[PDB]
Amino acid sequence: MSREEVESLIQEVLEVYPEKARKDRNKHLAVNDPAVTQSKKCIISNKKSQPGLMTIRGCAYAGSKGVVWGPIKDMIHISHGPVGCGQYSRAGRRNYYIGTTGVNAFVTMNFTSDFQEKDIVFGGDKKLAKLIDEVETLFPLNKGISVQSECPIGLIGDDIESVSKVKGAELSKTIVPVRCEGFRGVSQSLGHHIANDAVRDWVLGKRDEDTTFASTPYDVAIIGDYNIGGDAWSSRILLEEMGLRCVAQWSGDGSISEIELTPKVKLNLVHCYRSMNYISRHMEEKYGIPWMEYNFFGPTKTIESLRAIAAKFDESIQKKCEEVIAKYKPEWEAVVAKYRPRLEGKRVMLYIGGLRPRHVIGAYEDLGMEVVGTGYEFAHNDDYDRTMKEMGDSTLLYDDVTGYEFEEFVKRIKPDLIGSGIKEKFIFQKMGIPFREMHSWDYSGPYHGFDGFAIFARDMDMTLNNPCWKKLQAPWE
Amino acid sequence: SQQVDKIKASYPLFLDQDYKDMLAKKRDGFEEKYPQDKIDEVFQWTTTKEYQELNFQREALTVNPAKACQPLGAVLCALGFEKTMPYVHGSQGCVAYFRSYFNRHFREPVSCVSDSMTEDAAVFGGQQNMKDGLQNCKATYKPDMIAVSTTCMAEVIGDDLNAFINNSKKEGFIPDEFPVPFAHTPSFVGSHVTGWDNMFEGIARYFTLKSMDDKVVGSNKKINIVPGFETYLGNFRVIKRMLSEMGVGYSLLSDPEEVLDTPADGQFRMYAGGTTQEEMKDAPNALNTVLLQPWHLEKTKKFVEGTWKHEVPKLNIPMGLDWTDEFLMKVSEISGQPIPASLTKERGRLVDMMTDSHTWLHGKRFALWGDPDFVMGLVKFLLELGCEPVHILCHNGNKRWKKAVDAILAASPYGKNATVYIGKDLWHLRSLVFTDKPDFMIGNSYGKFIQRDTLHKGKEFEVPLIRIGFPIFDRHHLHRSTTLGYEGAMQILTTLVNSILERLDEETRGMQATDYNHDLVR
Amino acid sequence: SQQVDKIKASYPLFLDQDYKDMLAKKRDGFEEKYPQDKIDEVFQWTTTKEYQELNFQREALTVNPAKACQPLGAVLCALGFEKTMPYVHGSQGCVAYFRSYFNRHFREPVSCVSDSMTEDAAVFGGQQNMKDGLQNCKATYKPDMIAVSTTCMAEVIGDDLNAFINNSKKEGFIPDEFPVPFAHTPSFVGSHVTGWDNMFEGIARYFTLKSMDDKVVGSNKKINIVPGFETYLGNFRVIKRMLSEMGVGYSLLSDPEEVLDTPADGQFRMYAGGTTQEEMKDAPNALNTVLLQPWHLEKTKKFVEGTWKHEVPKLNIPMGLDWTDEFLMKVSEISGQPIPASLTKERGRLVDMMTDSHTWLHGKRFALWGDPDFVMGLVKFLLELGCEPVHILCHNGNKRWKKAVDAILAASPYGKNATVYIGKDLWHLRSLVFTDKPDFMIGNSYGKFIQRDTLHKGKEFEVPLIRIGFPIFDRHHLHRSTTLGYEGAMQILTTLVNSILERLDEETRGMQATDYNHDLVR
Numbered sequence A: 001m002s003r004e005e006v007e008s009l010i011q012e013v014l015e016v017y018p019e020k021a022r023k024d025r026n027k028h029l030a031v032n033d034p035a036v037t038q039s040k041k042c043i044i045s046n047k048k049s050q051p052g053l054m055t056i057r058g059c060a061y062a063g064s065k066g067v068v069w070g071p072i073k074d075m076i077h078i079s080h081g082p083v084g085c086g087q088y089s090r091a092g093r094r095n096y097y098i099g100t101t102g103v104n105a106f107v108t109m110n111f112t113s114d115f116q117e118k119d120i121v122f123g124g125d126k127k128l129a130k131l132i133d134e135v136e137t138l139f140p141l142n143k144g145i146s147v148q149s150e151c152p153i154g155l156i157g158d159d160i161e162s163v164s165k166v167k168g169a170e171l172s173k174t175i176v177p178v179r180c181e182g183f184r185g186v187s188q189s190l191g192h193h194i195a196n197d198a199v200r201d202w203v204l205g206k207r208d209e210d211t212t213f214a215s216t217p218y219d220v221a222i223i224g225d226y227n228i229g230g231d232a233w234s235s236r237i238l239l240e241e242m243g244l245r246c247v248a249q250w251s252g253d254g255s256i257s258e259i260e261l262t263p264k265v266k267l268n269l270v271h272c273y274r275s276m277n278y279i280s281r282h283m284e285e286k287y288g289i290p291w292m293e294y295n296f297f298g299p300t301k302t303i304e305s306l307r308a309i310a311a312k313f314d315e316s317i318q319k320k321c322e323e324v325i326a327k328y329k330p331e332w333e334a335v336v337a338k339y340r341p342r343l344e345g346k347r348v349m350l351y352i353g354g355l356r357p358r359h360v361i362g363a364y365e366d367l368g369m370e371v372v373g374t375g376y377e378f379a380h381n382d383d384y385d386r387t388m389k390e391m392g393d394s395t396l397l398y399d400d401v402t403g404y405e406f407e408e409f410v411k412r413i414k415p416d417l418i419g420s421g422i423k424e425k426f427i428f429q430k431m432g433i434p435f436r437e438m439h440s441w442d443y444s445g446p447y448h449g450f451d452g453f454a455i456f457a458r459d460m461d462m463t464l465n466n467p468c469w470k471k472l473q474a475p476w477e
Numbered sequence B, C: 001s002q003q004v005d006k007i008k009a010s011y012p013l014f015l016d017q018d019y020k021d022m023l024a025k026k027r028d029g030f031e032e033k034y035p036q037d038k039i040d041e042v043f044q045w046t047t048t049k050e051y052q053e054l055n056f057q058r059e060a061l062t063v064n065p066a067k068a069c070q071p072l073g074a075v076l077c078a079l080g081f082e083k084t085m086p087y088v089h090g091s092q093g094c095v096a097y098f099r100s101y102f103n104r105h106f107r108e109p110v111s112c113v114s115d116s117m118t119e120d121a122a123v124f125g126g127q128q129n130m131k132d133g134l135q136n137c138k139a140t141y142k143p144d145m146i147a148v149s150t151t152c153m154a155e156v157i158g159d160d161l162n163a164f165i166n167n168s169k170k171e172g173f174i175p176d177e178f179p180v181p182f183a184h185t186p187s188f189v190g191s192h193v194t195g196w197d198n199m200f201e202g203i204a205r206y207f208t209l210k211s212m213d214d215k216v217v218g219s220n221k222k223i224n225i226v227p228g229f230e231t232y233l234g235n236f237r238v239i240k241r242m243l244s245e246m247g248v249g250y251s252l253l254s255d256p257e258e259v260l261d262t263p264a265d266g267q268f269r270m271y272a273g274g275t276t277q278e279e280m281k282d283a284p285n286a287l288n289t290v291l292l293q294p295w296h297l298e299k300t301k302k303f304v305e306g307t308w309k310h311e312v313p314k315l316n317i318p319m320g321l322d323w324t325d326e327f328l329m330k331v332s333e334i335s336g337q338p339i340p341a342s343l344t345k346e347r348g349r350l351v352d353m354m355t356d357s358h359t360w361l362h363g364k365r366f367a368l369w370g371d372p373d374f375v376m377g378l379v380k381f382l383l384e385l386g387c388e389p390v391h392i393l394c395h396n397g398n399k400r401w402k403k404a405v406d407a408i409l410a411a412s413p414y415g416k417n418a419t420v421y422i423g424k425d426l427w428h429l430r431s432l433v434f435t436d437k438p439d440f441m442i443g444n445s446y447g448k449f450i451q452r453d454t455l456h457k458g459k460e461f462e463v464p465l466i467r468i469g470f471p472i473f474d475r476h477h478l479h480r481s482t483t484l485g486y487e488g489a490m491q492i493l494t495t496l497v498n499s500i501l502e503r504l505d506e507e508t509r510g511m512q513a514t515d516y517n518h519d520l521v522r
């Protein structure tokens, strides 16, 4: 509630900015109105960041190599360019997989061209060809190669597409070049689109003339779940217990074969709209496969999504869904009974770029917590159209919030908890507000499904109610 | 299925029967995985000598590098000055990755800004980006100084910072007297330490190049200290303590230990401590300047000798016993102050600890990697303990450094088996530790994946890892330790001897199998 | 058979096939060993709850005790004074054990003498032995003070120390002005901490009994600090640094840190540092006396409050965050010196580490043992960290201390599963950790066997040990660590978090089995 003083608070925070920066940043801060279906008249997103304001956004390389292509385990991903880009992104994301690392799985590995000045000056393509030959020599059990280009590759001028075609024809193995340069796009959002285009153009249509796969009318495909801490497995066990068979996972713990076999699926289950809606729409137009969004955050959203998914099949699937709901009711009911009293009525601010802030709000509300402010660094206008209904009235909405803006909002609102990334974790831990790392689940999890709800509740109780937060002020101060 | 009293995280929740069955169904149905026999055969092949030869015939592909890019070191250098904002002219992903890396290592907030250059700046350059970024950063975060480095994007398209900054100053974006030092830090040249050197040289040249008329060497009777790329707070603290104990006036340049160790008391200090601009202006009045890590501080050495007219001593990093003694004696000779009894007592205590633990350290084989100066100091100290380095790795080393390390090894009977590798990566080190098994590894957290690999071959082939270097991610508050001086040598000795003792204790824990050597007293 | 290039010690030489065959032949031929199945069944029965009931029904048998006798603590107390020779009135065999214990823990030479009483002295007393011992020790080792302790045998015989010392004084064996304090330390009463208390009270009474006329409280504007039985040098160092850093005049009585950390510079110093005799004489002139370890300094407190007329404050051991704060505030109130910014900066940094590590520290179960004050402060710090101390054991504790710890536990929600045991030994703790498994154990090296026992039941039943206490025998240079104050809190926090993370890394190192949780960043 109380929209007037949050409006005036926005005005006070926007006072330090220069005129141009103030004018732009005024469009990205809004007061939530749940009765609005078109966010374009209230908030503006997917615009460039103002220079020198400590934005949290990344690059398209992070949104392509580190997000979409990275979780695929049996392929080798070459960070084409200088070493640092692949160095800082190595094993930083907890996309879980099962495989022998260095033999048939290469997720935590860092393959890079390691460009020098002589590569910046004299071409670089022949180095790419020699690198592909060496990769084939030393890693024979890989099932594909992707070349994620970094910033200098486009700048110096290079044709990685011809090298990919020539070496793929010569070695009879798929090579996917991804022009995921950092300067392309204002955030990680365009990296998702570029990676989806690469999958569509070089991988998805491989098994078009093949019909050796025995498909059943219950086939589904999990798309947009990247198995953070085992999230995709927690969703998969619920989907399999409902009578469905999943042949593909995009892309957490995924494989090249799952991606190739996905077009033989009767229903596309899209968890993350922002990163895979492009490929879902393409597969709907080409192969005629319908797709829907589902939510597995908390018990209420899990039950709703399970019933909605079962509604697309025959009656046996609905009966199985009822069976699994009845089976898992006492578990989450006990978790709620144990943990809601400690967390009832506590306010939380969220800032995770992309799909997670609208999705997590139902899980928070399940434990009696209220979200007072939210925002995404890279989300588009359709995401803000989707999230306005979820959020409460006269609550704060931000888009690509700067460090100063977020710090001032947190100091004025004074929430009981903040869920965000590593770049702001210690900032707010210094000021004495409990903090949770939403992007990595603070090295815990999974949080999807009934099995993940218990871990979610335990983590939030252990962080919000920790005694260390009561010793910030010295007794003699 | 979860029990509300014993809630399981990913491990060991995904070890239940239902989850195992689900994963087996997934693998058997829709993965086309290779047979386990083939996987085992290829893994055993990867640990052979022929595979090592194939691995060392690499020229284009590098797997698991042990170095970063220059602007990371540039930001680390910029963080060490009072109320200084690191600014990276280029894309924003670079700054995001730098901040994430430093946050994960130090577990402290890291402040840096970018001009968010994009396709428009790729086509038409980033002059407007620089102007707007400088104005916005000064207006919002209110720094006394802005320290500008470059992203590889800005380096390839030939964006020159001098003209951009002068244009911004003369068009009213920032005041003309506002200090904006700059440096060019291409990511395809050198590594992070090179970026640190470039940025420090840029700042020193900005503050001292145009005021060399009234500067006389020795006027302020202090000694300048340049630490270099340092990620240990204890390394700054021990140098300050040792220099203040001798009564030597000093001036630490680019020390970020204050901003990187802010207290948690309900307030967020975005700036804390650091060297003031006055000490940078008065730097060439010092008696001399000492470079703590000279192998990555060569360009700043050229600047100091050519311009400041300082006879920079030829000193190694103060790691170990001999090199710390040489550093102390050189500082005493320069400053004219005698070494006090406290430092003699500390050195005697270090020698006592060396003699107490010499039995367990003799003949141990080590495979280490890191930065040139740190690796050289570590190899030297291992030679003074009777230990035997075997595989010495430096991904950012040169021929001169390798020759110096070879000369150091030749002057000790424990360096015959030791071999130095430059330009190699961690995959090469995995092959080396598979074919020539040492006792322990010494390096950053990236070596942990090597240990697991060895454990897959067998318990008797496992090579445990000791976490000394940058970055350490899997452990907490190890950045608070020391590596330089007698204190750092004491800590390193304790870590090594206790790792050896813990390994021995683990190997002899089976009852009625090997517990006869499970001694209470070691 | 031994290879000259690779020589094997007992492990793994005795794992060779010939040695294995010879051991099997011996066992099957002449040992008449029980069948292996019977041994396994008995071991399984020893881990059950019925065995725990039988073991807790013990009334006369003590197995694996966690304490020593009084003269050990008395010798440690005597070592804290300048040029003081610890003297033990009794047989010579136990002095050798004291010296061996302290040599194995501190890894430093410990000096002590005995009069070597024999059964001939048993039937007629040890008066002549005392005379000859005093004369020979004074002539040979030239001390400025001799502190006399009693072996249990001299206590059973009933030798009067005062009469023997006076008789030695008046007969010319020792000069009449030579200070020879004495204390009665029966080994069948209390434990080593009680011996420390007895020796300190004896020395204080010797030096400040007959001279209590020209004594005014608060004359010298200094605070007396009594450390008690302390085996960490870092504790003395941190107390001294914390007191001197805020400008408080202090007087550390019986500090041994200098004599137990002498440098190795080619010469042997039998005495070094310690408390001066004039310091003991000027003790009653202090404004107040602070006892760092009240629960084993009861008689010292009685003497101080009854003779020195000092209002001893109601202070706990400065371990943790709240208790260190209370100690600092009490010292500031007594001395009138405000707490400086450096101490609050250190407190903020410690809170920073707690905030950073609470995620991994929360909910873990610990079974700890040790001396009463160390155990109680460790429990308080664990409760501050959100940790669960489930099995609290103190062999030399009393009902008063148990009630105090129960009151401490009841004030925290994390003490719901906490049980305090007094008078129980390490076999009881083995049964406790077998029937109610905690996550970790916290104690001295004697717990290293319990871990082994757990590993025999299974890997999933193993309880790793954390070496914090006295004595630590299997690790090197752990006596230099800090335990009291903010610095000690940081060290303990780092040790606990890194032990937890190391256990996780070991558990998740299985390739294709559990390596899905082998996170690089933790």
Ligand code: ICS
Binding pocket: A063, A067, A093, A188, A226, A228, A272, A274, A275, A352, A353, A354, A355, A356, A357, A438, A439, A440
């Ligand atoms: S892909 Fe996106 S920033 Fe949808 S780039 Fe990012 S593993 Fe976030 S809110 Mo890190 S659009 Fe996934 C995401 Fe969400 S890396 Fe993960 S946590 S659900």
Ligand code: CLF
Binding pocket: A059, A060, A061, A062, A082, A083, A084, A085, A086, A149, A150, A151, A180, A181, A182, A183, B069, B070, B071, B091, B092, B093, B094, B095, B097, B150, B151, B152, B153, B187
């Ligand atoms: S936005 Fe993205 S992550 Fe940034 S560079 Fe560009 S592709 Fe890469 Fe890697 S190497 Fe270092 S950090 Fe950059 S400056 Fe040159």
Ligand SMILES: [Fe+3]
Binding pocket: A426, B106, B107, B108, C352, C353, C356
């Ligand atoms: Fe921190």
Ligand SMILES: [Fe+3]
Binding pocket: B352, B353, B356, C106, C107, C108
């Ligand atoms: Fe010693």
